[PDB]
Amino acid sequence: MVSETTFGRDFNEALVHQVVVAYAAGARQGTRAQKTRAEVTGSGKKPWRQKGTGRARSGSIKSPIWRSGGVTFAARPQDHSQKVNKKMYRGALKSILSELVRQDRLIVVEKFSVEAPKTKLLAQKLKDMALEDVLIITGELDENLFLAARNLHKVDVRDATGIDPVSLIAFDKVVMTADAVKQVEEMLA
Amino acid sequence: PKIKTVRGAAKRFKKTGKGGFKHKHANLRHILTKKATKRKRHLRPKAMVSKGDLGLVIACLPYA
Amino acid sequence: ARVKRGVIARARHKKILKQAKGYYGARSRVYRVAFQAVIKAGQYAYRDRRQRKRQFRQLWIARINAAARQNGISYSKFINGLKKASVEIDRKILADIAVFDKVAFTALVEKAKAALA
Amino acid sequence: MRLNTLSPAEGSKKAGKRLGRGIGSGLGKTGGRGHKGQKSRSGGGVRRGFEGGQMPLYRRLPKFGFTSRKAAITAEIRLSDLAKVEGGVVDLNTLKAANIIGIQIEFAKVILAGEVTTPVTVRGLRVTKGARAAIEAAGGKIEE
RNA sequence: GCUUGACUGCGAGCGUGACGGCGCGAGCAGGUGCGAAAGCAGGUCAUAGUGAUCCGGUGGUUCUGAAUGGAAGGGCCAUC
RNA sequence: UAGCGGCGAGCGAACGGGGAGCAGCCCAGAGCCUGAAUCAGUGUGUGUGUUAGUGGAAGCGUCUGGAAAGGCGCGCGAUACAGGGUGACAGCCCCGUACACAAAAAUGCACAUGCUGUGAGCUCGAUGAGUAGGGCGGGACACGUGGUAUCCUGUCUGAAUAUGGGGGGACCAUCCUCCAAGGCUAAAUACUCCUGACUGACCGAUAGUGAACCAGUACCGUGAGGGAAAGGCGAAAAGAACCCCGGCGAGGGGAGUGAAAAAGAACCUGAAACCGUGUACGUACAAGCAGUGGGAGCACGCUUAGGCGUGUGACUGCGUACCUUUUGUAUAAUGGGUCAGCGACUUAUAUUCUGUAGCAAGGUUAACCGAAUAGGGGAGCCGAAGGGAAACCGAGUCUUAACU
Ligand SMILES: [K+]
Ligand SMILES: [K+]
Ligand SMILES: [K+]
Ligand SMILES: [K+]
Ligand SMILES: [K+]
Ligand SMILES: [K+]
Ligand SMILES: [K+]
Ligand SMILES: [K+]
Ligand SMILES: [K+]
Ligand SMILES: [K+]
Ligand SMILES: [K+]
Ligand SMILES: [K+]
Ligand SMILES: [K+]
Ligand SMILES: [K+]
Ligand SMILES: [K+]
Ligand SMILES: [Mg+2]
Ligand SMILES: [Mg+2]
Ligand SMILES: [Mg+2]
Ligand SMILES: [Mg+2]
Ligand SMILES: [Mg+2]
Ligand SMILES: [Mg+2]
Ligand SMILES: [Mg+2]
Ligand SMILES: [Mg+2]
Ligand SMILES: [Mg+2]
Ligand SMILES: [Mg+2]
Ligand SMILES: [Mg+2]
Ligand SMILES: [Mg+2]
Ligand SMILES: [Mg+2]
Ligand SMILES: [Mg+2]
Ligand SMILES: [Mg+2]
Ligand SMILES: [Mg+2]
Ligand SMILES: [Mg+2]
Ligand SMILES: [Mg+2]
Ligand SMILES: [Mg+2]
Ligand SMILES: [Mg+2]
Ligand SMILES: [Mg+2]
Ligand SMILES: [Mg+2]
Ligand SMILES: [Mg+2]
Ligand SMILES: [Mg+2]
Ligand SMILES: [Mg+2]
Ligand SMILES: [Mg+2]
Ligand SMILES: [Mg+2]
Ligand SMILES: [Mg+2]
Ligand SMILES: [Mg+2]
Ligand SMILES: [Mg+2]
Ligand SMILES: [Mg+2]
Ligand SMILES: [Mg+2]
Ligand SMILES: [Mg+2]
Ligand SMILES: [Mg+2]
Ligand SMILES: [Mg+2]
Ligand SMILES: [Mg+2]
Ligand SMILES: [Mg+2]
Ligand SMILES: [Mg+2]
Ligand SMILES: [Mg+2]
Ligand SMILES: [Mg+2]
Ligand SMILES: [Mg+2]
Ligand SMILES: [Mg+2]
Ligand SMILES: [Mg+2]
């Protein structure tokens, strides 16, 4: 239109939703636990005899019914990562990239560079382009543009290899070098 | 972990093309002299598991 | 994701206790008792929306009967007479007329008497 | 298209049952387990095939047959697979290279399943009467 | 009187069972008896006379046979 | 899966394949040539870490306020907008952070180079015996003695030793393959009492450690051992000079501090049960789940000047709590003194069905590689063919000598 199958396909919301959700699920650390009744510190002594005392029968001081007792279904560390089918991932990226074009959020440039590793230069470059919140996608990792962008929270600088579906949706605009477009097309076919 | 096959069921039932199970008939191991030839002849071919029993067989044979 | 119940639990208990205002003793103070009291109040109110219609009709009939007998006719004959006269005035209105406009009630009785005789 | 304007497909995300959360839910109190008995209990319920003590079906029926070791190393090739090998010679090795059969398959048979439309040499494999006709119809040779 | 149909392989269809099963069955193939022949015979007027599976035994059958040829063991059929 | 298995419950391989990581050696002995190879040990250097540190950008005005970091206005730094603190929320106030530097002394590591052991290389050899194997008893092998190979050995025995021996799942032959009865050996692997940094759809004081607090304490127990409760004034103590009642009390009232003391130390918020004081209405001729439907009166408010609303509720119809368990409960069956807080269908993996999404006669990868949620990796798995116990045949196949 670049490839039409990549940059001019219909927005499959359900597919994009699954891949975005999976991405966020992949970010989860899942590091936690509680103590079951097995793991709470204490004796296995029956707190009082089964019969005759007039109290509800007790077995463990660690019972989850009890204050200070175990958690009934104590959490363990979990892996929250989902499988995303390769084709569903690539399908979602094509839908996202195509929507960015339809919404006028993908800007393509022949080159995007700054001279020195200086945040002031990039800030001035961006405000000349009517940009503020922007994913900049370059063909390669450039030191100076990366270092310039690091302290700008609204700005992220990637290579073509490190695109992800959340970032394409998250940033208001997406600047792509012409070289990055070639690589992203090559990626997605 | 993986479900374990009930190994005794795997020795008694074979899954057919449309997902039924064939089995060998009971009553043809011994005490054969008193049984009519007709009765024994009808017990020789394999038979299909009935509808009432398929649930029990399927439970026992998750990897059939 | 531990959820503490306090704020929601409080809100629910308060909602019930607000509905139990005016009730005696534990019924206006204590959630366990107030909850039963509020449920029962609702059961009775449901029942008594039906009973109210029964009780008011019963009251109207009693008053029509009194007013009819002042005018020399039973309730049962009066109603039969009005039906034969093709008067469709209902018991609520008849009972109200019986109290507030005794001359119009007398005219209804006279109409009813004419229909039977 | 924002992170707060993406929805799942309708019907794709059904809410899980939560038992024992009050009358309204329809799963309050007993949690769909009914009243009492082994099946109401935590960890309760009989093993697979158990029929209450009646000799179960998988024990009142006789065992039959044996398992063949040869069948595990025997495969069936479809006619559709004949054009997936490289070079147009269908041997045991060329099928293995094309990932049609597993590496430990020693015996393979071409059956009349799918279709063939190229001259293929089949070598060292059994071929069904129908497969042989189909291979030969498309100009192929069955070398034994 | 003469005989071995108390046959072997099957079986349209049906009955009766939760199921395992159990029952009735014309007809088809092979081979048989009795009858001049039509025919009849797959036990007995019928309905009881029974015991799943496992394990193992015996006979048959190269179906299988852990390098290969065998064998063992297993399978299948008959039977205990 | 193959198998094992009162062939029950269950137990459960290997071959082969894909990966991580890879590394080979020595003695059973002399001779020749010599100490040459390679790791050890103990020094000197050499870098490079560690054990203190150093520098480290840029903001003001005005508004609200007790206080400004907030609002508003206009600036500035950013390889630093990690984070923390500061009288409310600070890139620019402070401590940091990015980044760039630093060691007198000790010491980890990687090398370079002495010294002392160490012996490389070549030819000639040699080639682990109470052992292998066996009988008996056990045990181990996924394998329960089974047709049971193989391993270990308590007991009794007992070879051949390279022209020999072991194994190839009873056993034999053939063939193939390996060389026991001597030993050493890095990496990939396991773990965290402990140290540093960093992270969390982990907890937030009945939670999270038993322990946020002088807690393994108090306390209990002869002892082993058991084992708590208990966090928050304020920005700052400015923690209330002084006066008054009181016992030179407790406690309080003023005063003063403070934005606030109804933040006063029994201190943030300050629920509920529970207990009071005040006011309105009702209530001392009246029988019961205490409400509900009807309803007068009284009090207090309000916009037809009217009714209306709020509280109360004389009188009157109806009316035996809830849960549980049951054929059935007001039941004199069960449970609950009340409140508050906590307290029960989860998690992992496998499997099937449904929905939904992708791709479609294909679908999908696992470990792993990759800083890479990418990309690679198709080893596998499921499916597109079944029938038969099986050989085997195959849109058929099995059955049977053969099928109507
Ligand atoms: K940035
Ligand atoms: K249920
Ligand atoms: K015949
Ligand atoms: K300001
Ligand atoms: K700050
Ligand atoms: K021995
Ligand atoms: K040999
Ligand atoms: K404890
Ligand atoms: K505690
Ligand atoms: K009443
Ligand atoms: K009872
Ligand atoms: K009792
Ligand atoms: K499932
Ligand atoms: K699905
Ligand atoms: K057929
Ligand atoms: Mg706890
Ligand atoms: Mg991948
Ligand atoms: Mg038999
Ligand atoms: Mg929380
Ligand atoms: Mg109250
Ligand atoms: Mg229900
Ligand atoms: Mg119950
Ligand atoms: Mg019951
Ligand atoms: Mg039940
Ligand atoms: Mg239990
Ligand atoms: Mg393959
Ligand atoms: Mg007879
Ligand atoms: Mg008889
Ligand atoms: Mg047995
Ligand atoms: Mg063999
Ligand atoms: Mg062998
Ligand atoms: Mg600074
Ligand atoms: Mg404040
Ligand atoms: Mg040796
Ligand atoms: Mg040996
Ligand atoms: Mg031995
Ligand atoms: Mg032996
Ligand atoms: Mg043993
Ligand atoms: Mg051997
Ligand atoms: Mg605690
Ligand atoms: Mg608290
Ligand atoms: Mg004082
Ligand atoms: Mg206050
Ligand atoms: Mg204090
Ligand atoms: Mg505060
Ligand atoms: Mg307070
Ligand atoms: Mg009286
Ligand atoms: Mg009175
Ligand atoms: Mg009384
Ligand atoms: Mg009553
Ligand atoms: Mg009873
Ligand atoms: Mg009753
Ligand atoms: Mg009773
Ligand atoms: Mg009771
Ligand atoms: Mg009582
Ligand atoms: Mg009871
Ligand atoms: Mg009680
Ligand atoms: Mg097949």
UniProtKB/Swiss-Prot annotation, chain A:
InterPro entries registered for this protein in UniProt: Ribosomal_uL4, Ribosomal_uL4-like, Ribosomal_uL4_dom_sf
HAMAP family xrefs: Ribosomal_uL4_B
Alphabetized UniProt keyword annotations: Antibiotic resistance, Repressor, Ribonucleoprotein, Ribosomal protein, RNA-binding, rRNA-binding, Transcription, Transcription regulation, Transcription termination, Translation regulation
Effect the entry attributes to changing K51E: In strain: N282; confers erythromycin resistance. Ribosomes bind erythromycin poorly and have reduced peptidyltransferase activity
Domain of life: Bacteria
Coiled-coil residue spans: none
GO biological process: cytoplasmic translation; DNA-templated transcription termination; negative regulation of cytoplasmic translation; negative regulation of DNA-templated transcription; negative regulation of translation; response to antibiotic; ribosome assembly; transcriptional attenuation
Cellular component per GO, a single term: cytosol
Miscellaneous section: The erythromycin sensitive allele is dominant over the resistant allele.
Assembly with partners or alone: Part of the 50S ribosomal subunit. In TnaC-stalled ribosomes forms part of the binding pocket for L-Trp with the leader peptide and uL22.
Lineage: Bacteria, Pseudomonadati, Pseudomonadota, Gammaproteobacteria, Enterobacterales
Molecular function, one GO term: mRNA 5'-UTR binding
Keyword match Lyase: no
Phenotype when changing L122P: Does not regulate the S10 operon in vivo
Chain residue ranges for the region called Disordered: 32-59
Family according to the record: Belongs to the universal ribosomal protein uL4 family.
Protein's recorded name: Large ribosomal subunit protein uL4
A Pfam family per the record: Ribosomal_L4
Curated annotation (Swiss-Prot), chain B:
Single GO term (MF): structural constituent of ribosome
Record SUPFAM superfamilies: L35p-like (SSF143034)
GO BP: any one term: cytoplasmic translation
InterPro entries noted in UniProt: Ribosomal_bL35, Ribosomal_bL35-like, Ribosomal_bL35_CS, Ribosomal_bL35_sf
Cellular component annotations (GO), alphabetically ordered: cytoplasm; cytosolic large ribosomal subunit
A Pfam short name: Ribosomal_L35p
Keywords: Ribonucleoprotein, Ribosomal protein
Skewed-composition ranges (Basic residues): 9-21
Protein's UniProt keywords contain Nucleotidyltransferase: no
Known partners and oligomeric status: Part of the 50S ribosomal subunit.
NCBIfam families: rpmI_bact (TIGR00001)
Family: Belongs to the bacterial ribosomal protein bL35 family.
UniProt-recorded name of the protein: Large ribosomal subunit protein bL35
UniProtKB/Swiss-Prot annotation, chain C:
Keyword Ribonucleoprotein appears in the UniProt entry: yes
The keyword RNA-binding is assigned to this record: yes
GO molecular function (one): mRNA binding
GO cellular component: cytoplasm; cytosol; cytosolic large ribosomal subunit
A Gene Ontology BP annotation from the UniProt entry: cytoplasmic translation
InterPro entries: Ribosomal_bL20 (IPR005813), RIBOSOMAL_L20_CS (IPR049946), Ribosomal_protein_bL20_C (IPR035566)
Key words, A-Z: Ribonucleoprotein, Ribosomal protein, RNA-binding, rRNA-binding
Coiled coil stretches, renumbered: none
Function comment: One of the primary rRNA binding proteins, it binds close to the 5'-end of the 23S rRNA. It is important during the early stages of 50S assembly.
Quaternary structure and interacting proteins, as annotated: Part of the 50S ribosomal subunit. Contacts L21.
Stated family: Belongs to the bacterial ribosomal protein bL20 family.
Name of the molecule in the record: Large ribosomal subunit protein bL20
Organism encoding this protein: Escherichia coli (strain K12)
Swiss-Prot record, chain D:
UniProt KW keywords: Ribonucleoprotein, Ribosomal protein, RNA-binding, rRNA-binding
Annotated segments matching region Disordered: 1-54
Cross-referenced InterPro entries: Ribosomal_uL15, Ribosomal_uL15/eL18, Ribosomal_uL15/eL18_sf, Ribosomal_uL15_bac-type, Ribosomal_uL15_CS
Compositionally biased spans, kind Gly residues: 21-31
The UniProt record lists the keyword Ribosomal protein: yes
Single GO cellular component term: cytoplasm
GO biological process, one term: cytoplasmic translation
Molecular function via GO: rRNA binding; structural constituent of ribosome
Similarity remark: Belongs to the universal ribosomal protein uL15 family.
Role summary: This protein binds the 5S rRNA. It is required for the late stages of subunit assembly, and is essential for 5S rRNA assembly onto the ribosome.
Description of how the protein assembles with itself and partners: Part of the 50S ribosomal subunit. Contacts the 5S rRNA.
NCBIfam families referenced in this protein's UniProt entry, alphabetically: rplO_bact
The name this protein goes by in its record: Large ribosomal subunit protein uL15
